[PDB]
Amino acid sequence: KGWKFQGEQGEFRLEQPEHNSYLYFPLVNEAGMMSAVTPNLHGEITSGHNTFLMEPVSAESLHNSKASRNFWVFIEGYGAWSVSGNSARQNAARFTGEEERSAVEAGFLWHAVTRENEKAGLKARTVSFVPVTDDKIELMRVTLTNTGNAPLKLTPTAAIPLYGRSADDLRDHRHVTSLLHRIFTSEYGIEVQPALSFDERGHRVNKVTYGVFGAEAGGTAPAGFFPVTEDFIGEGGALDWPEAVVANREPDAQAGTAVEGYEAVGALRFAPVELAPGKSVSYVVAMVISGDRIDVGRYAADYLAAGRFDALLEQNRAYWRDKLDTVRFSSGDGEQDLWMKWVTLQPILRRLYGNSFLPYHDYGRGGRGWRDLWQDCLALMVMEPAEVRHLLLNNYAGVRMDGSNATIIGAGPGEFVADRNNIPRVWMDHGAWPLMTTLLYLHQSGDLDLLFQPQSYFRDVFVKRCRERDASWTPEQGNKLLTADGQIYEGTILEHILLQNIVPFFNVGEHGNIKLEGADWNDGLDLAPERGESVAFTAFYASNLMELSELLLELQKRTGKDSLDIAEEMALLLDTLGKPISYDSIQEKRSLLDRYYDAVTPRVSGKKLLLDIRKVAEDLKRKADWAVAHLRGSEWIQSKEGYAWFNGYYNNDGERVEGDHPDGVRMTLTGQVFAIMGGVATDEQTEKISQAVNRYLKDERIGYRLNSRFGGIQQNLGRAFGFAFGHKENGAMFSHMTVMYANALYKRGFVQEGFEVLDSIYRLSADFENSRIYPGVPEYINERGRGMYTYLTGSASWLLLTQLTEVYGVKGRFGDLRLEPKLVQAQFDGSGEAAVETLFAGRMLRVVYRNPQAAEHGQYRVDSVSLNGQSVDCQNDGAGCLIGRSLIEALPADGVHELIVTLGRNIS
Amino acid sequence: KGWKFQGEQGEFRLEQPEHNSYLYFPLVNEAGMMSAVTPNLHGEITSGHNTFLMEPVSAESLHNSKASRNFWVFIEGYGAWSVSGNSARQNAARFTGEEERSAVEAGFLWHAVTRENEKAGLKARTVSFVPVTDDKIELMRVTLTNTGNAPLKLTPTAAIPLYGRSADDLRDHRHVTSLLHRIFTSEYGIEVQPALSFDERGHRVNKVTYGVFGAEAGGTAPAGFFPVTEDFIGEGGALDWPEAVVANREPDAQAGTAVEGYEAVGALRFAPVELAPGKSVSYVVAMVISGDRIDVGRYAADYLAAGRFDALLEQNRAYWRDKLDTVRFSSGDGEQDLWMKWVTLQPILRRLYGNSFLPYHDYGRGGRGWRDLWQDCLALMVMEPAEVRHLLLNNYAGVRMDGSNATIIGAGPGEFVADRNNIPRVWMDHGAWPLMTTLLYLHQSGDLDLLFQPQSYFRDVFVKRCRERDASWTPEQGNKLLTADGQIYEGTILEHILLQNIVPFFNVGEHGNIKLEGADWNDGLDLAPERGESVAFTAFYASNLMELSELLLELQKRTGKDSLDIAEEMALLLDTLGKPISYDSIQEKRSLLDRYYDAVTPRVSGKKLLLDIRKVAEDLKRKADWAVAHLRGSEWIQSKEGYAWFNGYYNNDGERVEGDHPDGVRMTLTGQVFAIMGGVATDEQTEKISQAVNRYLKDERIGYRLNSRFGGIQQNLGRAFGFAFGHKENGAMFSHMTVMYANALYKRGFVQEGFEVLDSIYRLSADFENSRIYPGVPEYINERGRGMYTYLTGSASWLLLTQLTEVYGVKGRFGDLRLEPKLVQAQFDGSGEAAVETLFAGRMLRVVYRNPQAAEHGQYRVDSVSLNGQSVDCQNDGAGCLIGRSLIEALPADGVHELIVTLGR
Ligand SMILES: [Cl-]
Ligand SMILES: [Cl-]
Ligand SMILES: [Cl-]
Ligand SMILES: [Cl-]
């Protein structure tokens, strides 16, 4: 019943594709055309929240709305027929065993729908893609073929239903705003340019223009048009059975006609044609969004002229092949290797959609959040590392002097927007992710000097981590932290990082773990700001502080830096250097944090202290050691049944969330992941955690759940518990957290367990009968096994990163290349090999692991390593081998350089 | 081919009704169930913005969404079939000449869709109505009849697609919010009660429950259910072709099943049945919204038991017949008389829908605006007068001490909400409508003492007609104007009225007419707050001031009141009493108004002056005379062609809006109406205005336009000009203003002209081929002749009122009954009669005008008047005859009392 890969480049085919609800496929470009296309050509087309070409949709629209893209043929002796099956007549064959043969084929990045009218002897194939040009444009090519024994007489009509305004107008002033429409017909099609826009921006003049144009393959313009939706469908008609097509009416309008005040359709009537047996005719349709009236002449020459569609499709295929060839996996599981190419696409899709504008993602307006700033750097480090350094530098401008950060991202490089009107949430984990991302950069690049670049701090009306409003703020101060004498304060990137991690350490709740604030990574743990605690992310901050300590000593060891320049007020938080407070006292830690807040609000002095890098490291290690001992001694729990794991949470009544409970044990995956990843969990505790996970969270049908079932809503904890169990942030297999769990297991050497987790995600995703999704990893697998919120999920970045840097084990260590395979025997192919092609230190490498002895992980070691046909010496034997960055950089820039790692068995 | 009336109570029928786009019919009750139903059973069902049972829709949804109410029959030998024609199979017959025979019949207040499957020998009839009980409920009865020669085997499935949450979720978090759904099945159907609500109110616990229940005619419960929409439609299915029906699957769920996290459908599978030739089976479906989980047992007993649908439908018919029988017209145009019964319904509909929740009305959230507070009193004064006095008193609490008013209406009696976050618009005409409404009340009731009742004034952060923010404001001031000593200030209703009308007099622009502010009645004249002027409403205020003057002298003449108690600071604005300023000086009028504003901001002193009622009247007449002379002398314009009329507007560049212009003369209807109505236009000017209207605004196809064509957007005037010409506030036949034009013409004795106007509205509305609406008056007739924004339009209140008080001429004069017919000869029936049944001074009267000499208007007069078979004396010959209120009040309370007015030459 499912899709099947064809060829070796990731192309797939699915038979009878409209027999599955809710399917859609993405077409997008950098210019900003963002489309979704279903098996009957429904979906949406937009350049932003305020500029939808086709009507904004959600999931239920995909079956319930008749307004798909469409292309009609009026077939002599048969009548009206949709090339995608979206007509009332064709839809009425569903569930009667009389459905027409159909298929979807797709690739990088294009989509093809096929259909056969056996009765009439007609076949159609409709190819959709977004060209890789600088226009906001989607193209469609319909090819019709006479498969029968006699000539067919056909009258074609393209029909792209238009919306042409803000999603704010979907219902609210939907009809009123239709009165603002202005339609202009020209030789090749229809433009709609509303006179005004009425939406949440207010009432303004509009110039944005939405166009539908078309031509025959040979360049011939349409014979005429039906630009007005109500006239096209006819009195009592609809877009899946429109009178103009069904009664084969003469066109309403020719070129040069203007019509005002009506909903519009890009309905293009082509000349009738006699199609000989075995012959084809094709039509090209272009859907365009532009900032002003369209130069229809240029668009016709560029997109509709004979041969342009085909040339541009080849350009699309080459551009996407080039983007995705930066990472290629090769293993014994060829299907998973191909599925991984789709995973590899997803991080790009998230960037170019702004996590929005696909049917399930029905609320996004295309912006970026704080998390995205750091997360987007993960795939880029592997696939396109040139801009990573600049992004990281810019991102740190968003940090406040209390360690919190701006939460609305602006247009410009390192631009952040203050909202003085809405009191914003603080997410307690926002300070943890930046160091994780930045450390990866440091280890891939070797660019330790990034840490000493200067950067400003964000400043707005909100102080003491949004606990109060500063009465002294003005528009005249601007959005940057100021010194006493009025200058923009600048500190090192490292100063920003230290602040982000040290502040949460002191911001403890009544049970001594770091406060939940408005939520952590689970945005649905939003109802415990007063007394909630994220033990889960206390582990992450503990680990961050420890890594920082190690980082600083390594900076001294490598850079020779003996000193750190830090704002003088931050010396209060590095209490180990002066008069140390008791970290066992919640009162003392909170009081100290209050003194710090007072010292830096509204302004800093601008004086900096130069502090011994070892002494700062020592302070960070004291904090980290304290947190580790506290978590192990106070937050390690056990059920009566005998399983044990880490409590992740305290609720808004100050109660421990996890453990035994009426109606079942309560456990969270999030409470385990960072404990494992960061080392708070001992090896023994990690083994025990994995047993508890497998007992309480691992579902036989849907895999590793985010949490076990809490009965009913949990109004002292979060809105997540209002979702049905097994959906979204309540107990679904939430891919992002599950992948991080696997990553954590691989990091700690629990390779078979890690493998099981990663393999479960793939198996679930690829089990089409239940998942009902195309190749890729979804945001979650739900209670019924369905894949939900496709393509845009951050889990793809983590899956890609984990497969590369943990499973195949190709990763940087201070700029040097560390190779440490964690492949299991089953992953090696019929030639005893598994390989990855990957970019490192500006060179493309094919890292090939040879396991001729077919040893399991734990039974093998690196016997020898060769590069470009020559022996490489390595500065390690245990763990894995380490190759100096110079040897990579010395390779030629052109071509793929093969690096062969031969694996042999262990002695004794 | 249009609708046709059947019988004499306003019931109509339309053949092949789904052959027309966008049709819908309203079903509503006082309890708050608000529904729309189309010929294929689409539309919507809601109790408010946040509590939609069926998905929120606009006009395009009515064809584009498959999620109609539906009822399916799986017919052995034929397969799946929709009783309303909404299946993929049946829709595919449209435009092929193979469509099934169908009809809509409707009445007060119910709807019936019929359909025939000729192939199978099956007929269906589906009746929808909202019971007039205290529940928020819609009922549906489907009756199936075997019209063939052999038994039919039928499997029925009701299917009401559910939404069950806020319109805010239509797309935004549509899917996320589906995860909050909780579905519960019981013996008689399906309940959906979301665990939480996520909408513009925030994230909250929800208890509201949406139910779909059903039974066979005899009370037998459904055999089972398909509560989950995706399971009902099946993989790749849709609501117009759902697998559960099409493949005739066994039910997914029985009573006692709970399902969480999925969009829901009220899909009720009834037991299969063998239907004999000629025989019928019926099913009843109930759609319910409740504040908490539904007592399904009680609903089954009350709504699903054998015979309850029929009893409740009869109760519905009797309730609505009783509401609408308060006004009945009878003339030579029987069809118009019946169409007027639908017009008579509309003011009730506007109240019970809150001008919202019908497909075209896709933005209203069910509240009331300032205008509604006064406008709603119009229909109530003639249909249901008991609460009118209380409403009027409460409404005046919303006036600020600068004559402006609150624009957000609250929950409680005379509750008004401060806006606070948005700097709000001031609508310059908001102060004019209250006196108009109140004067009508005074003349219908005789209750002159209303004018002396005390009332507070509204107070918020906005002062000087929202030109500045009060620096002294806090939450601790509260929502009411305070005295110097800290007391809530109270002034008479008359004080409020005087203020509302005197302030605009001084608030003049650079050309000397009253400032446009954020708009007048045309809400789309919103882009000239700095320099715009509404000459149009300057005429209305001029007339109001003159009527006030007359009112005060009449108060003295009747009440014996020699004094008016008025806040001392308002004496500044009655400058005729002290040191008069020059009304010819814009500077002096504005300066004086500034001194007044300063005197009452932030507080009044609380001291009142007693002022001679004649002297106040004299001040008001001076103002009114000044305004009249200024408008006649400065705003009367003429085109080069020789037509002449009143300029209505100055734009934000201080330019005169109307007159000759490149690409065509610019004229507004609004600039004429109040000039005529209020007397600013002389009789000569009124004749000339009517010629100019007919020349520039009267379209042969669509009737009296609101304005002539201004080419392109007009960003120094208003957003209205961004609408396509002939739509909404840009040049459509906008019924409300056109009716007021007619009213104005009748008032001034231009009866043939008035008749033409009113008759055009009817003809346009009833020309179904173009209008494509059911009986009633629409908000506008558009460029293509289509009726738009049906049912809820305030034009119905004006049409009703004008037909009663001007055309038939049955109106109050200080509580006495004045009869002054303005019927044309063609309006009299074959017996030479035209009549109106109407409620006056608490009695139902049938006023019959007999015109045996067939005289035209202007050629006839009142020869004699008789009441219940006895001669009535009249205290008037000129204008019309006047009957003392006592003679009416002395009549018996039960029954309709006939009052025969014989007309001679
Ligand atoms: Cl067929
Ligand atoms: Cl956003
Ligand atoms: Cl058929
Ligand atoms: Cl509202």
CSV table of C-alpha atoms and ligand atoms in Angstrom, one decimal, chain A residues 78 89-90 92-93 98 119, ligand 1:
chain,number,residue,atom,x,y,z
A,78,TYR,CA,-17.5,11.8,-21.9
A,89,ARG,CA,-18.0,12.9,-10.8
A,90,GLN,CA,-14.6,11.4,-10.1
A,92,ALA,CA,-18.2,9.9,-6.4
A,93,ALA,CA,-16.2,6.8,-7.5
A,98,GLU,CA,-14.5,2.0,-9.7
A,119,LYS,CA,-13.4,4.8,-20.5
C,1,CL,CL,-19.4,7.5,-14.1
